[PDB]
Design a protein around this ligand. Structure first.
Ligand code: HEM
Ligand code: HEM
Ligand SMILES: C[C@H](O)[C@H](O)[C@H]1CNc2nc(N)[nH]c(=O)c2N1
Ligand SMILES: C[C@H](O)[C@H](O)[C@H]1CNc2nc(N)[nH]c(=O)c2N1
Ligand SMILES: NC(=[NH2+])NCCC[C@H](N)C(=O)O
Ligand SMILES: NC(=[NH2+])NCCC[C@H](N)C(=O)O
Lengths: 413, 414
């Protein structure tokens, strides 16, 4: 047929026809491929595939530690095989889940902080059963993770998937996120990215405080239930007010950002089974906030105002005012986080560390799935070592898959 | 167990327990939306044994009308309908029958003062309609006709009757033209606060929130049984009157206006057993509706505060009767403004006097006249009006214009 291609700035969509007349087509540049998503269900994962997946995992698990528990290996193997063939699905040992989350992170080809893969905290919420109960696990998480600026990587694993109609899901893109409202005067306030998701919350009776930085409410769904709106306790949301170390007028911009980068809506797959709810977090890398969040035309879009107050030639592309501005916004972010004693890493050190990660990774297990397109910082790419490193992107297991935005695939009352 | 009482001002709800200790002698009279005045949903057609006598009764009403009855046709029609009823289930009215139906249903509406005009009505037959887009057109034809560039004309457009009860035509709007109400960011409320919930609805169905004080809401229509199709009204069709006082030049500074067309949308016409859940109709405004209710209710535009202020009255002293003074001026503003721009309207006094004449004609004629004193007495200057001093009985006849459960409460989502 054809291939759908989207421009994340315009939202403009294109359909490729020409690719057919191809030679005797890397999807690479595509953002949400079906090859990285793990969709809904109605029937539990059929045995023939669930079984070999599970066994693979357990052989991986028992393969890790020095001096293998040879007997326990077969014992666990046998036990699991029977455990599966009998009830259908199967439960992981706590220790196993730990290993899974760390390995799944180790296998996230679009993450640069993977050198930190072994340093993770797991919150076993597998026995959770209600939204009010989820909310509490989430708060425990945010709080643990925030740690008063000294950010700590953690993940909270909710009950696995059973049949398909009994899914635990966080509807948010990430734990903390600012609201975005299309205003009457034709304009747009706050984070333009979370526009649809914000309207959604408004529909579910959320109180729109109409601001640039209004933390979005938590939308959660347990077992198979309809989503429950939970306003996040403000004392839990640590923020950093943006201010330049030389441009005192920068503070006048009234900028700030949340210290916690916790991905919400992703799915953890392991040994065949999948957990559709498992928010996790690490810490920020300057460019994320400075370049992406602040400068994207699709997001906060500040660049022009920053180049303007900087005295640069805003009307001449060739002047490179954008390169000048953005760099200043980056130092602002790094500076502000640095000052208010909140963890963050610059793209340079981040890259240098990822490079050392790879060396350890190849020397260790033989490879390292990497998505060049993603791993190369959004600014000063070639100044970065990763830009000069060839790399292969490939899905392994366990893994963190994306998933169909819940509000689309859902049975209401 | 107990009775629910609502205060339409604060919107507060109360539960009456005491009424049980009542006597061996409980007027609901004060209640706005009783069940006795409503006619809800369905799942099955009208059981024949009922449908039949109602139909015959109706046909007997009709033919019993004309001077020198068409006895043969009377019998024939009875016979034909009886037949049609047993053959189809439901039955269809001769156009002239509908005409008579709508005029009587109006004539039987106890809460209307304009009823002396009961015989001067225009009926638009949209019974053969089948799509929302098609409704929309009939509606525009209606609005256009009614408006008549100021010389307002009373009319009603009758859509398809009820079949089973899951195949109903319904206008979700209170009335044809109606300003929107938005609960704004700064905690305030712009526009008509009465149309707040309904606005959000239009918003949810992807309506473009124009965020103003006078934004004419979109027609939310539903055909056969299919979901509501949102249709915005053509601004050229919506005639309005900008409010301005004949002496207080500062009154126009208030930026006030109001639509010229009072067309009730969501009511139901019952006749000879059948029922049309969609049949918008209109008369013309009566000053006090806009001047007192629309402009002065706490739950509506609520202007009284500043109309008094700008008039210079002692706004913080109830006993100064400033509210009495202010309102009266708002009323003349409205009457003046309508009169000025050649848009039909009637002051409450002349209206009441004419209604008194209506009764005299009505009793002498048929023997009664259903009246809801609570509704018929103007919201201001009650006793100055003849109707205040008039005792009246409030009873439901047939045909009739019943209220009906707000459709968004009882609807299917495919
Ligand atoms: C230790 C701190 C960490 C740093 C500095 C780091 C940094 C990054 C960066 C820069 C991105 C790009 C985000 C974007 O462009 O939207 C990213 C993506 C990602 N990270 Fe890491 N990360 C860290 C920890 C983690 C942890 C703890 C996990 C898993 C438990 C993880 C899982 C992922 C995944 C799955 C993505 C892909 C997100 C997506 O596809 O939208 N990261 N990370
Ligand atoms: C000729 C001009 C007419 C005038 C001056 C008039 C006036 C009024 C007034 C003052 C009310 C009270 C409205 C309110 O307080 O909400 C009312 C209610 C009503 N009118 Fe008349 N009307 C007229 C024509 C009509 C027509 C043409 C019909 C029907 C074909 C009609 C049917 C009704 C009904 C059923 C109500 C009750 C509304 C409700 O219960 O909410 N009116 N009218
Ligand atoms: C279209 C293109 O794939 C897309 O804009 C990319 C590129 N690389 C990225 N890299 C990271 N880390 N994060 C991103 O959002 C993106 N987006
Ligand atoms: C509670 C009370 O019945 C209610 O406020 C009434 C009284 N009479 C009325 N009379 C008219 N014409 N219109 C009304 O809305 C009302 N409201
Ligand atoms: N460092 C991370 N783990 N980031 C993941 C999500 C953060 C996201 N890029 C943001 O700017 O909000
Ligand atoms: N004259 C009428 N038919 N009025 C019926 C509805 C008008 C309504 N009372 C209003 O002020 O908008």
């Amino acid at each position: 047929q054809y291939v759908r291609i989207k421009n994340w700035g315009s939202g403009e969509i294109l359909h490729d026809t020409l690719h057919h007349k191809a030679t005797s087509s890397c999807l690479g540049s595509i953002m949400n491929p079906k090859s990285l998503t793990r969709g809904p269900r109605d029937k539990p994962t059929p045995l023939e595939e669930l079984l070999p997946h599970a066994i693979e995992f357990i052989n991986q698990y028992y393969g890790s530690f020095k001096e293998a528990k040879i007997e326990e290996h077969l014992a666990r193997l046998e036990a699991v095989t029977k455990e599966i063939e009998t009830t259908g699905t199967y439960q992981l040992t706590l220790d196993e889940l730990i290993f899974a989350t760390k390995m799944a992170w180790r296998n996230a080809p679009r993450c640069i902080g993977r050198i930190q893969w072994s340093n993770l905290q797991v919150f076993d919420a597998r026995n959770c059963s209600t939204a009010q109960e989820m909310f509490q696990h989430i708060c425990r998480h945010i709080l643990y993770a925030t740690n008063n600026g000294n950010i700590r990587s953690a993940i909270t694993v909710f009950p696995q998937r059973s049949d398909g109609k009994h899914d635990f899901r966080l509807w948010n893109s990430q734990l903390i996120r600012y609201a975005g409202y299309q205003m009457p005067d034709g304009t747009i306030r706050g984070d333009a990215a979370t526009l649809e998701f914000t309207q959604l919350c408004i529909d579910l009776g959320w109180k729109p405080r109409y601001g640039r930085f209004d933390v979005l409410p938590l939308v959660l769904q347990a077992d198979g239930q309809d989503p429950e709106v939970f306003e996040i306790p403000p004392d839990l949301v640590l923020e950093v007010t943006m201010e330049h170390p030389k441009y005192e007028w920068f503070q006048e911009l009234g900028l700030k950002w949340y210290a916690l980068p916790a991905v919400a809506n992703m799915l953890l797959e392991v040994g065949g089974l999948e957990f559709p709810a498992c928010p996790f977090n690490g810490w920020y890398m300057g460019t994320e906030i400075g370049v992406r969040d602040f400068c994207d035309t699709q997001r906060y879009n500040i660049l022009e105002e920053v180049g303007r107050r900087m005295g640069l030639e805003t009307h001449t592309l060739a002047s490179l005012w954008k390169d000048r501005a953005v760099t200043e916004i980056n130092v602002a972010v790094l500076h502000s986080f640095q000052k208010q004693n909140v963890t963050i890493m610059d793209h340079h050190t981040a890259s240098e560390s990822f490079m050392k990660h790879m060396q350890n990774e190849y020397r260790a297990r033989g490879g390292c799935p990497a998505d060049w397109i993603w791993l190369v910082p959004p600014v000063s790419g070639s100044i970065t070592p990763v830009f000069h490193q060839e790399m292969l992107n490939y899905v392994l297991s366990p893994f963190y898959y994306y998933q169909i935005e819940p509000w689309k695939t859902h049975i209401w009352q």
